[model samples]
Every structure is written in C-alpha cells, then in structure tokens.
Target: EIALTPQPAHLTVKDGRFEFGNQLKAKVTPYQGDSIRMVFESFKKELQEATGIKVSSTQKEAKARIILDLNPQLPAEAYKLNVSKKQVRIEASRPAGFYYALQTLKQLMPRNVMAGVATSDHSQWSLPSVEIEDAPRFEWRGFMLDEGRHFFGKDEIKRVIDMMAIYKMNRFHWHLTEDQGWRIEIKKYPKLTETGAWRNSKVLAYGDVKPDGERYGGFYTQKDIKEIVAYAKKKFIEIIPEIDIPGHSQAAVAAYPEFLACDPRDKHEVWLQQGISTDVINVANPKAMQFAKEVIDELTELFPFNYIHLGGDECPTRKWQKNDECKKLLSEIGSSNFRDLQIYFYKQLKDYIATKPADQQRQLIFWNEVLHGNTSILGNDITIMAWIGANAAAKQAAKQGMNTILSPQIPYYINRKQSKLPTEPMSQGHGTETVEAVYNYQPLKDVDAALQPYYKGVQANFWTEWVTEPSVLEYLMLPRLAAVAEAGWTPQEKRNYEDFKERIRKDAELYDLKGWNYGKHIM
Candidate 1:
C-alpha cells in the first residue's frame, strides 16, 4: 500500500512503477523565475542525495524524465502529481505548492531516501505509479516549541523546522519568552538575554526542594533569528515569534527589575520552578510599556510574519492589585477590576503596533485568557490562540469575529504523557494524550456553520518544563506531530484514524532513518 502521511485530498493508484537512475534527466517549465528555480534546484539536490545518480536538468521538457510545470490555474498551495513508468509530472501554481509536491514525491520514494545519503543500490530507488491532487485544509498548520522553559539551540530548532516542513506544517509558533527564560535577543535590552536567559538552578518536577545546581538557558541573537527565519521561509513555513507579555514576563522583569518589576525593591530571580509565577510585569508603568513596544519593534524586524503572540495567559493580578500605578490606571479607565488592567495593557500595545507602517504592522495574538474580561475593547484583527478550554474559547473568539487557532491543552499539548505505561518519560502537565486521541481531534466540531471560517487551524504545542533532553522532546512530538499535520492538511471527510495508523506505521522507517527518537508505544 502507498503510505503517505496526511493522505492526499484525491489519489489513485496506477499499474506501474517509475525507476530512477543516472540516465534520467529533470526539467522545470518556466524555470526562469527565481522562486521556482530554487524549488527545482532543491528537488535536484534532494534527488541526487537520495539516489547516487546525479541527474542533470534539461531545458527541453520532452527530454526530461521528471517534469515540473507551473500552472496558474492550480491553487497557490495545491498541486497535482502523477507518476508513471516513462516520467513523473508535477504541476503547481506557486513555489510553495511545488515545494509540497516535492515533499510528497520524496515520501513516494523508498524510506531510506529521507536519510539524505546517496545509495548505490538500484533496488531501493523505484516508486509505485500514482496520481495525487492535494491541498491543505487549513492555512495555519502549526507546531509550537516553547524554548523558554528549556533552551534548545539553533541546530535543534532547525531540526524541528525540518521535521515540520516534511509534514507540510507551515507555522512554527516559537514560544520564545517565559518566566523561566527569555530566549530571543532584544538589542535595545541587552539585559534580557544576559540576565534573563540564565537561571541559577533547574527544577525537574512540580515541587523539588533540592534543585539541580546548574546554570540553564540560552537565547537566539538577532543574527541567529535571521538565519532561522530564512531557513523556515525556504521551507515555506512562517515563524511566529511569541514574546509573552505582562504575565510570563518574570524573565524580562528579572533582567530589568528596576523598570519592569511591579516593585523595584522586590528581589526576583529567573524562576526555577515549572508552574505559573506571580512575578508579572508592571504593565501600568510607562517604561514597562516602552519596553514592550521596543521588544515588539525588534520582533517585527526579525520575524517577517504578520502574527505576533503577546502572551496573555495565567497572569496573576495580585501584583496589579497592590501596585499604585496599576490601581491608578484602573481608576483612570473607570474600572474596579484588576483584570481590566491587562485589557488596557493590550490596548496600549495594540495602539503602538497600529502606528507602524503597513508592512511593519502585525496582527496581535493572545492566549484565550486575554478574552476573559472586556473583550469588546479588543480589535477583531487580533487572533486568539485557544489553549485553555480551546473549543469553547475558539467558539467565543469566532462569535466575536476574531480568528482562532485551536490548541487545546488536551490532546493538542504534546508535552503531556503519551501513554499510561511506566516506560513513559518524565513529563509535565496533567493527563495523558495518546496518539489516537490526537488524531481523533476534529477542528470544526460543535462550531456554528457560519463561524467555521474563523477557525483558522490547529497547532500542537510542546512546552519543555520537565523535558530537558532533546530525545524526550522528539519522543513526545513525533507520530503525534504527524497526526496534527494531517488534521490541518487533510479534509475531514478524507481522514480515517485506522488508515492513518497504517500509513504512520510505514512512516516509522523514515523516523528511524533520520535517527529521530520517537514514541514507539503508538507505532
């Protein structure tokens, strides 16, 4: 059986096989365009690496064994791929579609091709003939990595991006800043990285008295950010950088306590524990507001994507309740509730972001908690990432005419335990999210028919609290990540969990070839 993860929208098997060798030539129609040429070049390199054959590109389509055609009639991110004994044909409207088509083609090849090592064995290079028409169901098929709790450097980040690209996942929601760490460099605020990025000790569990006395954390410099952004762009993925504000600002507050801390006199260290910290930013302060804007300015310059996540979850208002500045702001806004202070803080940031030039302007995204109070003040342009009560929050966001991304903690949060088995790695959070549970998620369930458009897509979040090792992180993400990818790309009617399980069983070879540590329990 042809084992393609995220089964194509429409596909048919043919009675033949296409064999690749040194003699076969590749060609792209309208290859003069830089983007398509890049895609063509990448495909050639991938082909050469998979098989030992160094197939040459041709200007004449008839002379080529593999042909890439740019058809404007196709959807921008959709493609038609057909394979036969004589030749393989791919047609797409844009470079992104071509990139996806190539990905699909790679999967059609023997699993060893994913290893990127040139193989001399001709026996391993043939693909069953098939016809496929494919397109994504959601525009935002995303995977998020929270680097704040534990920092994995550039190489690991790139590796994750590569995995996401393979699955045709387009949005890399980078949770860069948190109470435990501030991972992205802010040039204007050098202290953010210098002080905030490093913690004195490590807390492996919920309540650990004796901490692992080790300095833990790292941040990506602007140069590093640029490199990663460019890498994701090449793979047709948009990196949405999340600089969580107000609530998860302890790292920032630790860096600039004098300006950011609710009380400058209070001592604050980069948090060592896993759970929520009460040390939120003093948003009532003008200097703190300026800091937020400056950080966003750097983010806009670094990440070209229009969506920026300003974390508005689990912010303790106790600090705001006691702070004079916060109380004064609340009175000025004619509100008694401390929660409204967050709303005002968001508005101020929104207003500042609105002042940017059209190209620099960003669509703000907040966690579902941001809508807890006075959501009427929020702009419809803002997107809500529904994590807490995700389904309910998504419905509410859609009713408010705001775009929502469903990332419910249950199932969608991969950081949780994958199974009840004792062999399961030490993990944080509550409950277990089995592979089948993740695959079973229906993005449009219970939504009013008209509000379905507001449900943008689905994202699986991996928050690293207890997950200190990269292997453990991969173990949690894989297979399940593929499940999320299919949910976002494949049409609901086209999906079958049993069929997906069968296809994914074949995908285990690719994972093994890449040396990716994944959950064997599900496989």
Candidate 2:
C-alpha cells in the first residue's frame, strides 16, 4: 500500500545489503512543476518488465518531490544520483537527467523490500553520494533482417534478436518473402516453401568476380515461424514477417501459378528481373482474392502480432490492364484509372483478408508505394509502412490520419552494395557507413506540425545480398544493428549516438571474447 514517489528511489550500497530501518518512505521532486497522467495501457507495459516491489506515484504539490527522473533529454554525464541511510537525491540540470537517475534507481533496488527517499537536485534536495541520471529521446525501436535474398536460417535469426533485446529494440521485421525466395510454410499449399523456396542458381559473387553457382534460395517452415514468434515474444519484441504479396509473388507464383492468370506458364518458374512486373495476380478473379485470403489466413495463424503487411509496393498493372477479365472488373468497379484498379485490387484483397479477422479488424499494411496519389481504397485502420521517404508520404499519411512506419533507404537499407561502381564490391559502397550511422538515425524532425504521431518509428534493413553466410550475416548485423536498435527506441533529443556506439563496442568485444560468431570489425 506504499505510495511511489515521482522520482525513482534507490538504496545505498552498504556492503551490497540494503541499509534501512523500518518505517520505509520516499519523496520525489520535479525540477519544475510536473504531473504524471496515468494511462492504464502504458502502465501495463512497464509492469511486465523488471520485477521488484510495491510502487505508486502521487500528484506533485509544487515541483515534483521524487527520487529519480528517467528522462533522456537530460545529459547523461551532468546528472548525479546518490543514496544514503537517510534519503535519496537526484541532481541534474534538466528533467531528462532526473529521468536517467530514476533508471539507475531501478537497478539499485533490493529484490524484495519497501523503501523511501527524497529526490531533488543539489541543495534543492541534495545528498552527498554516488549519483545516477539518464534518459533517451525515442520510444519505438526496430531492425529488419531479409532472410529471403540471402537466406539466413532461423537459428541465426535468434542470435541477432538476442543482441537487439539488450539494447531495447522491440520490433523485429523479418523480410521473409521476395523474388529471390519465399519463406514461411503455407499449410494449405505446402509447395510455397517446398517447391517455390529453392532457386535455379545462387547469385553470391561481387562485381565480375561474383560467382554464379547455385546458392540463392530457401524459406522457413510454418513450424519454424511459430518457434520464431515465440522466441521474440519472450524478448518482448514483435516479429513481423513480411510476405511481399501481389508484387514479389514470383515465389508464390512458382508455387501456385493458378493464383495468377499467367499461371501454368508462370508456375514452377523464376523471373530473374528482380523488379516489378505484370506477372501479377488477376485482381478480376475473385478466386485470386480467395487464394490471397488463405495465404493471409496462414499468415495470421503464424504471427500473433496486430499488423499484417500486404506489401503494396512495386506492383505492375500491365498484366491486369491487358487481361480482358481485369478490364471488365475495373469498369464494373467504376475505377477507370489503372492505378485505381490496382487500388481496388488491394482494396478487395485487403478487405477480404481483414474480413476474416486476424488480431481484431483485419489489419492491412503496405509499403509507401501503395499511397501513390490516391489512398481512398484503404481506411484509416490500415497502417502504411513508408520505406522510400520520410516527408511526403509520412506527411500525407499523417494528413489522412493513418499510422505509418518510416524507414528511408539511403540510410536504412543496408543493401545497395554500398557503391554504384560496376567494379566495386556489390555489397561494399554505401560510403562505408559503419554502426555509427545507424546509431545516429532519427525518424522525425518535428512531429507536431503536419507530422502526426502516426509515426510508429524507423528501422534499418539488411537485404543481405552479398553477405549470405550465417556468419557473415551475423557480423554485418550485430553491433551496428544494435546501434540502430537503440536509435529507434531512444528519443532523438536524449540519445547520444556516440555514447551508444561506445557501449556497443564494449558489448561486441564481450561477444568476441565469448567465442560468439559476430563478424570482424570493419576498420
């Protein structure tokens, strides 16, 4: 029944034992007057993490009278937190510093004990002893691993995930499907993985030296995906498996050619273009929509998350435009614009998939390309993941009041071979952006104006074209991906990319020392 203070309360370190008489109590103070609004949803999130003892917070009379401030905007080095036999004090120049002190207090708390202290800065509420304070700028953090292009097995995935959790990145977007490969086991059509999973040849060479043997395809079984989702849940990260539908359905087409009008011919074959094409599904065919429904049904069954990405990017309507059936349907739907027909196609597909209901309403997610010019086909309930740019799509999505996740490629996509030179390593040119660049990425500049809170967050994608080996993939993503994870989760105002990078280096050293297979450091 003890009421928690506005500040985080910590215990004095006297021989590793808590030194406190009975009648435990604590007080908190805000540098300025501050009040905490109780939102049950957000509260439940914290209660699930790190366990300790009874806690509660009250309204501040003037300045917040508390033990710790866990804000990130405050400078990390400037804040000081001290605990003694009598009380606890958090000293910092900014509210963020106080927030950091609160985090330290959590670390210093006894396993099962009730305690109290007064929190404030220096003379304002000073106590001489070791002090701690820190805070971050962002809250939503994420990382992307494309197992399709350069297939990394499920076990390799878990390892990357383990590192991400340590840094508090809560989302793991698995780019599980693509033209190169189709991952995930489809119960209705076992061939989605069994037949469509393997490619004719593996493309794993760099420049002209790039070897052209057979090493380019694989997919995860439904059982495997189930295991992955469970693994991520234990770490508090949501596993979003991307099945690049309609557009990158080459693999799916290979598995179920009947799903597309080009089927039979398209079935069991591969298109090496590695880009958009007319080999799209016949939107005019309700059968096509039904097939997608079954696939999505399996997707919903496989993943427990709320959002399902339908991959509305790079869809070519040439096939649908040329097909007599598609043209008739477009006229019937009263959408003469080809793009409109494409929009209606998504509308029908997404609508059908949702009607069955996965999490709640049938949730829909498509890449930024889906919103090109018109978005009337989709409702606000759909979450749009914009991968191309951070502004226009994000701003427009915001204007329409939709939830969006922004991950621009120039900085986030870890593919592109890092160079444009025909001779340069196919995977080595993006100007040698090391783990440091990832640590510094900020998803938004100002979210108040046209920018709606619709921003779920940003992420870094590892297309993994050149780095296909499990070991190489491990090295490419670790430490650097760790930094990206932190950047995505910490507040922009509070994060120090350098500081986080330094910590990652220390952690990476430990990984190497422990004989883990994380890759060698790039100069």
Candidate 3:
C-alpha cells in the first residue's frame, strides 16, 4: 500500500515503479523560475547523498528520468504527480506547489532516502508507481513554538521547520516574547535581550514554585533570525514572529521598567514562574507606545512575512486599573473600561504598521482574548488566532468577518500529556491528548458555509513551560503534529484515523531514521 502522511486529495496506484539507478537525471521546463530551480538543486543533493546515485538536472525535458513541468493553470500551492516505470513527472503552477510535490515524493521513497542517509542496499531506492493530485485544505497550517519560557536554539528550530515542510505545514508561529523571557533581539532596545532574556530560574513543576538556582535563557540575534527565515523560505514556509505585548510583557518590562504602570512593581525582574504576571507594559504611556512601535519596526525588518502576532492572551488588568496614566487614557479615548484599552493599544500599533512601505506593511494577529470586548473597534484585516475555546471563538470571528485560525487548547495544544501512563513525559497540564484525539479535531466544526472562508485554518501550539529539553519538545510534537498537518492539508472528507494509523506506522520508520524522539504511544 502507498503510505503518504496528510494523504493527498486524490491518488491512485498504478502498475510498475520508477527505479532509481546510478545515472538518474532530472529535467526542468525552460520557463521554471529560480525558486523551482533551487528546489531541484536541494533535492538533487539530498538524493545523491542518500542513495549514492548522481542526479543531474537540465533545461531539456526530453531524455530525463525525472521531469518538472510548469502548468500555469494549477492552483499556486497545488500539484499533480505521476510516476511510472519509465519516468516520474510533477506538474505545478508555482514554486510552492513543486516544493510540496517533491516533499510528497520524498515520503514515497525509502525511509533512508527521506533521512538523507546512504543505505547498504541500493535496491531500496525506488518509488512505487502512483498518480497524486494534492493541495492543502487551509493556507495557514501552522505550528507555534514558545521560546519565552524555554529557548531552543537555531539548529533545533531548523529541524522543526524541516519536519513542518515535510508535512506541508507552511506557517511557523514563533512565540518570541513572554512574561518569563524575551527571545528575539531588538536593535533599538538592546536591554530587551540583555536583561529580558535571562531568568534566575524556572518552575520545575506545576505545584513546586522554588527556583532551581540555575540561570536559564537565550535570544536570537537579527542575523540568526535572517538565516532561519531564509532557510524556511526555501522550504516554502513563512516564519511569523510573535512579539507578545500588553499582557505577556514582563520580560520587556524587566528590561524597561519605565514602561511599567505609573506605580511600578517594587522590583522588576524576568518572571521565574509559570503563570500570568501583572507586570504588563503600560499601554497608556506615550513612551511605552513608542517602544511598541520601535519593536514592531525591528520585527518588520527581521521578518518578511505579512503577519505579526501580538499576543493578547492572559493579561491581568489590576495594574492598569490602578494606574494614573490608564485613567487619563480612558478619558482621552472616551472609555472607562480597561479591556477597551487593549483594543486601543492594538489599533495604535496597527495604524503605525500601515505607515511603512507597501512591501513592509504587515497584517496583525491577536489571540482570542483580543475579541473579548468591543471587537467592533478592530479592523477586519486583523486575524484572530482562537486558542481558548477555539471552535466557538473561531466561529464568532468568522461571523464578524475576520480571518480566524483555530488552535484550541484541548487537543491542538501538543504540550499537554499525550497519555496517562507514568512514562508519559511531564508537561504543562493534566489530561491525555492522545494522537487520536488530535486527529479527531475538525477545523471547520460548527462553522457555517457562508463563514467558512473566514476560517483561515488550524494550528498546533507547543508551549515550553515544562518542555525545557529539545527531545521532550520533539516527543510532544510529532505523530500529533502530523495529525494537525493532515487536518490542515487533507480535505475533511478524505481523512480517516484508521488509514492515518497505517500511514503513521510507516512514518515512524522515517522518524527512527532521522533520530527524532516522538511519542511511541501512537505506534
């Protein structure tokens, strides 16, 4: 049987297979762009290294064993792949489509080939004959990593991006700032990293609040961000950097305490526990507002993606309600509610981003809490990522004519315990979110047909509160991450858990080959 993760929209098995030999050559159509050419070049290198077979590419398509044909009529991220004993042909209208097609082709190859390792048996390097027509169900199939609480460096991030690309997940929502730590460098505010990036300790478990006495933290410089962004771009993924503000701004406040409320905390420091902090930035302060703008300026320069996430979840308003500046801003805006201030703050940042050059302009994204009060003030251009009560919040956002991405905590939160077994890795919260539970998620559930288009897609979040280790993070993500990938890519009617179980069993072999620590519970 042919095993493809996030099963293709349409597929059929045919007689015979395409055999890989010492002299395999790939030919591209003359009209193919540099992006497509680059995809082939990378693929050529991987194939050669894995199978020990030299594969060359040419503009001439006639005599090549592998052919990439550009079809302008197909959807931008859609592709049609056909493989036979004589040759393998892939057709797509855009570079992303070709990239995805190759990813699917890689899955069809032996596990070793996907792992990019030379195998002792050269006979294993062939692909079964099949015809596949594929496209993602949603444009924003995403996976978010919270670097604020625990930082995983560049190489680990690239590994995650590699897995995301392999499964056709396009968005990498990087949660870069939080109450605990700030993980991205802001040129205008070096202290944002110098002070905000390091915390005295972390909450070892849910109940225990004692500091571990070990300093923990890290940050990615602008150069590091550029390298990761360029790498993701080659894999057809967009890196959406999240500079969480207002609520999860303790780290920022630690660096610039002047931004804190008029009556600041007795002592400002990077939070050492796992929970909401009242030390949010003083949104009412003019200097704080400028600080926000400058941070956005740095982000726009670092990330080229059109969307920027301003985390608006779990903000406590006690400090704001007690501030003199907050009272003055309330009178200026003709509103007395603290929640309204959150909306006003986001509006200010939104309008500020609009002043940039056309190419640098970015659409803003906020967590579901941003929609809690007086959403009428928000523009339809803003996207709401519904993490809490995602299904209902997503429906509300869609009804209000706003784009929404569902990332409900129940199952889409991969950081939760995967099973009830004692061996299950310690995670953020209780309850078992098995791989099947994740697979059962329906992105468009309860969404009316008219509002379907506003329901942009689905995302899975891996918050790193207890996930301080890279292996633990990977163990929590995979198998389940693959489930979310399918929920975002495969057509709803085409998905079946039983079939996914079979496909994942095959995928487990690839995971083993790649040395990824994934949940064995699913197997």
Candidate 4:
C-alpha cells in the first residue's frame, strides 16, 4: 500500500520510530524568523482540532518535538522533513513551505490523529521515522466549490478548506453566482440575496419530481465573506472569487430587470429552474455596464485576491440576434456576428477592471469559451481556465502563449456520477467520473509539451447542480477530491493508479472519522 497520498518527491525510510508518548509533552517549536510566528500557531490550532489535545509551542529548545524553520535558499513551497527517535525537524523556503510541511507531518501520524475526538491514549500516538524532501509539481493546485447552483454555508466551506490544506492544495476557486442562484451579498443589490438567491424549486437529475413550491437557497453576507477569506488566508489557500457575467446573469438580471437585454415586456427576468439560459445582460446598454461596475467594484473590495473570474462560458448568442438593443450595439461596434457581442461585452469589463486604482486592478481569469469564436480581441492579461474541451483548449492556449489552468469537464467535473451503479446517488445526468478517471488525467501531456511553462496547474470543479445537502456534496468530493489533489501535486511519472487507490483507501478513514459521506464505488 502507498504510505502517503501524492507521495513525496524524495523520501527515505529510516530504522527508528518517533515515539510520541504521554510524558513526551510534545510541542510544535518554531525557529526565529519573520513569518514563522503565525506558522506554528496555525498548525497548533489544527493539531488541537485533530487530536483534541491542545499543542503548545516553544521558541526555545524542546526535548520531544516537531520544529519549523524558514530557509529561503530552498525553492518556494519546498520543504525538507527529518524525523528521528527524539524529534522531527522541518525546513522550508517560504511560509507556505512550512504549511506544506505541516501536512506531511499529519500524514506521518496515526490515522486516529485526525479523528477530532479525545482518545483515551491519544498522547501515546506515534509516527514512523522518515526523511521527506518535497515540493508541489504545480503552483496552482486548486479545488472549485460551486456555491451558486446549490448553496453551502460558511462552516461547510471551512471544512473543505481544512481538507484541501491537508492535501497541499493552495487555491480555492469559489463559484459564487449562476443562473439558478446568487450566493453572495452585494450590499447595493438587496434583491440579489432577497429575490435572486432563492428559487421555487431546485432542479434535480432523478425522475421528474413535483416542484416543492417552497423557495430554497442561501447567500454569504459581506461579514461571512470576510470571515471565510480570513479563514482561507490562515490556511494559506488563495480564494479566487468567480462572478459570472454577460451570460449566466438571470439571477443578476432578475434582481435588476433594467439590466436585461430582451424587451422589458418579455418578462424573462427571473430565477431559472435549471439548465443554461440565454437571457444575458446587454452590455450595449450603458445601464448594463454601470450595473457590472457596481457589482464588480464591491467584489474587488471584498476579495483581495490576485484574479477575478469573469465567466464567459456557454453564452448562447441567439438572444443577442433577436434583441434590438444588442443588435444595434453589435452594428455600432462594426460586427454583425453575435459572438463578437460576447467579446465586446468582455472587453469593456476587462477595461473597467483596468481603470480602477492599482489595488483594485486585479488580474482577470475567464472560462474556456472566452477564447471561443475569437481570442484575438482579449488582452493577454487574462488566464484561460479551460473547461468545455479542456485538453485541446489547454494546448490551444499554450500555443497562443497564454497562461492556462486545466479543469476539464470530463474527469475534473466532480459533480458527475462516481459510477453507473444503480445504488449511486443522483448525479449530473450521464457518464461517470470514477476515481480512476480523475487520478489519471494528465494536465501537461497534451498542452504543447514544448510550452509546458504556460500550464499553471489543474483543479476539480464541483458544480453542485444535482448536489443539495452537505452530505451529498461530501460524498461527491471525498475520494475524487483526493485523486485531484494527487494529480496536481505528484509528478506524472510517479503516479500509478493502483498505488493511488491504496492510499485513498486509507485517506477514506479520516473522511469517515470527520462524518463526511463518501463514495466507495472506486472502480
């Protein structure tokens, strides 16, 4: 069986055991360094939550301990871990490296360490003696949580961030809005939460069940947003907030009907039951541009991250052709094609983000379709996150010298069924994304092997359309999330399907201990 998930790049098993006994008075000691102060404190918090035993920290020498240090000579996010009978010493180049080492330290402990309950002999737990030299294969190891279609509260989101941190994942992409629901509180747009956030009924994949007629949904207040951003910051995970635009604006338009491209008499401004809708915002109207500015301006203040996801995926242009205003705007822009309107809308917003003060000037990241029909108009400042035709699109992005993130819909879509088994829970109708498929996806294989540097990383997108409860979300994410973590962290040559399954089997226990429902049909 594999000893660790995303097995260390370089490891050496030793002959001794690091016995953590009751009398050990174990502490996570830290060396004198700038950012090293909060490093051990964060680990100590996790250590306490994991073992239900508060872990003390020391600046001086300690007999039985795990130590942290920052050594800039090493590469970023790289750490070297050494353990003997007495203590475990870890050295990393950056604060993130120290964070990564904490994860390595967790995997070395007994499975019961993460049980989050008091064990009678918890202090007696021990870890094997080993030396590990490790660093991530990619800089952007990410997990996308879709709170748009199906809302998950703050506590549940924290749980996912905690798990992602343990697996060495560094990016948390938040899909905050969609056609079905708007899950973020834009203070200026009261109806975004009051009216746009809920629907008469949620769309599902199982047999056509009668609509409950009861409104269902939830959203994160600005306070909730700050709390979550702080929580992720403490864990060293960057939160990429996605506010979809132009298309997927039913919820946005429903809240403010004047933003609609279609005639006001059409009455198309309302929450959709489900499925992709073409009722996009008309950027041709100056009011639509003003609406985008207001929403994104608040978003920039709320999220201090490097990139803002301007969703430009799956926008049907038939509505643009039919709408007189959008058609006139297209004509004025000197383009008859509807796709050009999509590009025109995106270009205006891209420029809007640029005009903000240097601090508000965040980088733009768009879905795969932004490049569709035309890519020449878009500035190179944007990062392409390929979703629809991921593999091919990634290669295409690389050839064009654009940075890319590979989130393929085929294997990277966690919302998909785990298997075709009848016993499996409801899925996003159609094919399954078994654990094997997720782990086997190679991000660098076809992305212009020559231009490998442009391939930033890979991530799993949990589009929770059929997903509702926290339990259902957990079942869909568990084993597959682990697999995605491995794909992003471990080197392709070192990856083996059988070895991963073995490692995930052991990882499943931690999920169970935490009371997360997970899929067992790993074929």
Steric clashes per prediction: 0, 49, 0, 0
Error of 1 at 129 (Å): 1.5
The TM-score that candidate 2 achieves is 0.72
Candidate 2 runs further than 4 Å off: 1-139, 204-216, 261-268, 272-278, 357-362, 416-428, 446-452, 513-523
Off by over 4 Å in 4: 21-33, 48-65, 121-123, 204-210, 429-431
At residue 380, candidate 4 shows an lDDT of 70
Candidate 3: misplaced stretches above 4 Å? Answer: 204-206
Model 1 lDDT tens row, 438-476: 999999977789999998899999988888778988998
Task: State model 4's lDDT.
Answer: 0.79
lDDT measured at residue 261 in model 3 versus the true structure, 0 to 100: 47
Q: Compute each candidate's TM-score over C-alphas.
A: 0.96, 0.72, 0.97, 0.93
lDDT of 4 by residue, 1-523 (tens): 2268777788889887876543334344344444665777766666666665455555555543766665778778899989888888888878888777877887777665644444555356667788899888899989999888788999999999977876778899999988878899988889888888887876532357555666688899999999999999887898999988878888887887765556555775445356788778776778888777788899888888878898878788887787888889988988867898878777887788888788888888889888876767776767899998887887778888888998988899898888888877787745458888888787787444587988899999998877888888988888888888888888888888998887778866777667778887752
Estimate the TM-score for candidate 3: 0.97
Better of 2 and 3 by TM-score: 3
Write candidate 2's Cα lDDT for 292-320 as tens digits: 77777788778888767777678887877
TM-score rank order: 3, 1, 4, 2
